[PDB]
Design an enzyme around this catalytic site. Structure first.
Site, short mmCIF file in Angstrom:
data_model
loop_
_atom_site.label_atom_id
_atom_site.label_comp_id
_atom_site.label_asym_id
_atom_site.label_seq_id
_atom_site.Cartn_x
_atom_site.Cartn_y
_atom_site.Cartn_z
N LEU A 23 42.03 3.29 44.75
CA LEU A 23 41.22 2.83 45.89
C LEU A 23 40.25 1.77 45.39
O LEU A 23 39.91 0.87 46.15
CB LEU A 23 40.50 4.05 46.49
CG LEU A 23 41.10 4.60 47.78
CD1 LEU A 23 42.60 4.39 47.80
CD2 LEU A 23 40.77 6.07 47.92
N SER A 25 38.22 -0.07 41.50
CA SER A 25 38.01 -0.08 40.04
C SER A 25 36.72 -0.80 39.67
O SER A 25 36.36 -1.75 40.38
CB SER A 25 39.17 -0.70 39.34
OG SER A 25 39.24 -0.24 38.00
N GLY A 26 36.05 -0.33 38.62
CA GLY A 26 34.80 -0.94 38.14
C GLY A 26 34.79 -0.76 36.64
O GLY A 26 35.88 -0.53 36.09
N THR A 30 38.06 4.13 37.37
CA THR A 30 38.65 3.77 38.68
C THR A 30 38.60 4.94 39.65
O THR A 30 38.75 6.08 39.19
CB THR A 30 40.12 3.40 38.46
OG1 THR A 30 40.91 4.47 38.96
CG2 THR A 30 40.44 3.16 37.00
N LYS A 50 37.99 10.43 40.67
CA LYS A 50 37.18 9.43 39.97
C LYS A 50 37.10 9.82 38.50
O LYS A 50 36.36 10.74 38.13
CB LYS A 50 35.79 9.33 40.59
CG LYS A 50 34.87 8.34 39.91
CD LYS A 50 33.47 8.40 40.49
CE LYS A 50 32.48 7.62 39.65
NZ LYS A 50 31.09 7.73 40.18
N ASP A 136 19.47 5.57 45.54
CA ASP A 136 20.47 4.51 45.68
C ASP A 136 21.12 4.60 47.06
O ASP A 136 22.35 4.60 47.20
CB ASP A 136 21.51 4.60 44.56
CG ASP A 136 22.42 3.38 44.52
OD1 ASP A 136 22.07 2.35 45.13
OD2 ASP A 136 23.49 3.46 43.87
N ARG A 140 26.82 0.49 51.06
CA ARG A 140 27.96 0.62 50.15
C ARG A 140 28.16 2.06 49.68
O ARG A 140 29.26 2.40 49.25
CB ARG A 140 27.76 -0.29 48.94
CG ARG A 140 26.58 0.12 48.08
CD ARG A 140 26.43 -0.76 46.85
NE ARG A 140 25.32 -0.32 46.02
CZ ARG A 140 24.06 -0.70 46.18
NH1 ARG A 140 23.72 -1.56 47.13
NH2 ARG A 140 23.12 -0.21 45.38
N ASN A 141 27.12 2.89 49.76
CA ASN A 141 27.19 4.27 49.29
C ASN A 141 27.29 5.27 50.43
O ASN A 141 27.02 6.46 50.23
CB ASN A 141 25.98 4.58 48.40
CG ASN A 141 26.08 3.93 47.04
OD1 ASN A 141 27.16 3.80 46.48
ND2 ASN A 141 24.94 3.51 46.50
N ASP A 154 27.85 9.13 46.20
CA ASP A 154 27.37 8.44 45.01
C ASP A 154 25.99 8.92 44.59
O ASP A 154 24.98 8.28 44.91
CB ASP A 154 27.36 6.92 45.23
CG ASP A 154 28.10 6.17 44.15
OD1 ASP A 154 27.51 5.94 43.07
OD2 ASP A 154 29.28 5.80 44.37
C1 LIG Z 1 32.25 -0.70 49.71
C2 LIG Z 1 32.17 -0.67 48.37
C3 LIG Z 1 33.38 -0.56 47.50
O1 LIG Z 1 33.86 -1.59 47.03
N1 LIG Z 1 33.98 0.66 47.18
C4 LIG Z 1 33.54 1.97 47.66
C5 LIG Z 1 34.66 2.73 48.36
C6 LIG Z 1 35.96 2.96 47.55
O2 LIG Z 1 37.02 3.48 48.36
C7 LIG Z 1 36.96 4.82 48.66
C8 LIG Z 1 36.16 5.67 47.91
C9 LIG Z 1 36.03 7.05 48.15
C10 LIG Z 1 35.23 8.04 47.44
N2 LIG Z 1 34.43 7.72 46.34
C11 LIG Z 1 33.90 8.62 45.38
C12 LIG Z 1 32.56 8.51 44.97
C13 LIG Z 1 32.01 9.38 44.03
C14 LIG Z 1 32.80 10.39 43.48
CL1 LIG Z 1 32.16 11.45 42.34
C15 LIG Z 1 34.12 10.52 43.87
CL2 LIG Z 1 35.06 11.74 43.19
C16 LIG Z 1 34.67 9.65 44.80
F1 LIG Z 1 35.92 9.82 45.12
N3 LIG Z 1 35.21 9.34 47.80
C17 LIG Z 1 35.99 9.69 48.87
N4 LIG Z 1 36.77 8.90 49.60
C18 LIG Z 1 36.78 7.56 49.24
C19 LIG Z 1 37.61 6.71 50.02
C20 LIG Z 1 37.70 5.37 49.75
O3 LIG Z 1 38.47 4.48 50.45
C21 LIG Z 1 39.53 4.97 51.24
C22 LIG Z 1 36.32 1.63 46.85
C23 LIG Z 1 35.18 0.75 46.31
#
Ligand SMILES: *CCC(=O)N1CCC(Oc2cc3c(Nc4ccc(Cl)c(Cl)c4F)ncnc3cc2OC)CC1
Length: 293
Positions: A23, A25-26, A30, A50, A136, A140-141, A154
């Site tokens: 979904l 990467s940073g 990822t 993650k 934070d 975006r979060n 986050d």
């Molecule tokens: C808008 C900013 C950005 O570029 N991104 C944030 C969303 C990402 O896509 C998705 C992420 C998730 C997450 N994230 C997540 C955060 C923390 C932790 Cl610990 C864990 Cl395990 C996570 F999985 N969580 C749940 N669902 C999604 C769904 C996303 O998109 C479908 C991409 C980058």
């Protein structure tokens, strides 16, 4: 007078879940999406996975996420202890609210914007009940489960207060922080309220960057000089006055999260009065319905 955190940390077998796509990467790692099938359960749960010495950081995030339980806060489903440390949480299919507000700006109504403002305030108020400071909060979060349901995520920078956090030095999101967090590195629940005001400003501008085209260092002085973010076009003075109240220099004169719920909930009862927008498998179980005590 500090309560014992009896939250459960669930260790997940690598067999129990399969990855599907990447979904995002940073640096660190990822975030992926996949399915989680607990053995001997006949359920498939859409999840997001993650995966140094930064393991101390990711395990701090897991501690916080496992200790929260609110319809507007993302909860940790579990961790996997393979060669890499993975965090497994419920899949938020529509991604972060910042990208969603940008990719759908011509189809977002006042009812959705104000409801999102209510739901984020509800989740933020829950974190205050749990004596948790996010540090934070931003568009975006905030993740989107459905267009009608958003959750805060986050908790990498989150810190639990005793019964005013003094950070040292770290890559911090300058443009979302209260003035005292810039100068004194003091973080309070009322410091998150300032971030909440910037987050609402992100929504009402459909994803604009706060202080766009300004150096991060010049922000501390213009905030002292009395300058804030502009009134968004769709914003009545009613909605903008609330955002301005979140950015007052006296942190205790700012609105409380419990009051931001009430004010925006009153506004969501008549959205067009406050926002002026042109033309207003088989065994799959969502994680919000899979509850193991
Ligand atoms: C808008 C900013 C950005 O570029 N991104 C944030 C969303 C990402 O896509 C998705 C992420 C998730 C997450 N994230 C997540 C955060 C923390 C932790 Cl610990 C864990 Cl395990 C996570 F999985 N969580 C749940 N669902 C999604 C769904 C996303 O998109 C479908 C991409 C980058």
């Amino acid at each position: 007078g500090e309560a014992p955190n009896q939250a459960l940390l669930r260790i997940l077998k690598e067999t129990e879940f399969k990855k599907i796509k990447v979904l995002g990467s940073g640096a660190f790692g990822t975030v992926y999406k996949g399915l989680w099938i607990p053995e001997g359960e006949k359920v498939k749960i859409p999840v997001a996975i993650k995966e140094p010495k930064a393991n101390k950081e990711i395990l701090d995030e897991a501690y916080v996420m496992a200790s929260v339980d609110n319809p507007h806060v993302c909860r940790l489903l579990g961790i996997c202890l393979t060669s890499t440390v993975q965090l497994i949480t419920q899949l938020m299919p529509f991604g972060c609210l910042l990208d969603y507000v940008r990719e759908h700006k011509d189809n977002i109504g006042s009812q959705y914007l104000l409801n999102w403002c209510v739901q984020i305030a509800k989740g933020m108020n829950y974190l205050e009940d749990r004596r948790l400071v996010h540090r934070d909060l931003a568009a975006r979060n905030v993740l989107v489960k459905t267009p009608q349901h958003v959750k805060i995520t986050d908790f990498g920078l989150a810190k639990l207060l005793g019964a005013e956090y003094h950070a040292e030095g770290g890559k911090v999101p300058i443009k979302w922080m209260a003035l005292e967090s810039i100068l004194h590195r003091i973080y309070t629940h009322q410091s998150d309220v300032w971030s909440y005001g910037v987050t609402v400003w992100e929504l009402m501008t459909f994803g604009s960057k706060p202080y766009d085209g300004i150096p991060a260092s010049e922000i501390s002085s213009i905030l002292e000089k009395g300058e804030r973010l502009p009134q968004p076009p769709i914003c009545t003075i009613d909605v903008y006055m609330i955002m301005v109240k979140c950015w007052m220099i006296d942190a205790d004169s700012r609105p409380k999260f419990r009051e931001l719920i009430i004010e925006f909930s009153k506004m969501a009862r008549d959205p067009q009065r406050y926002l002026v927008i042109q033309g207003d498998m088989d065994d799959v179980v969502d994680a919000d319905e899979y509850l193991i005590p």
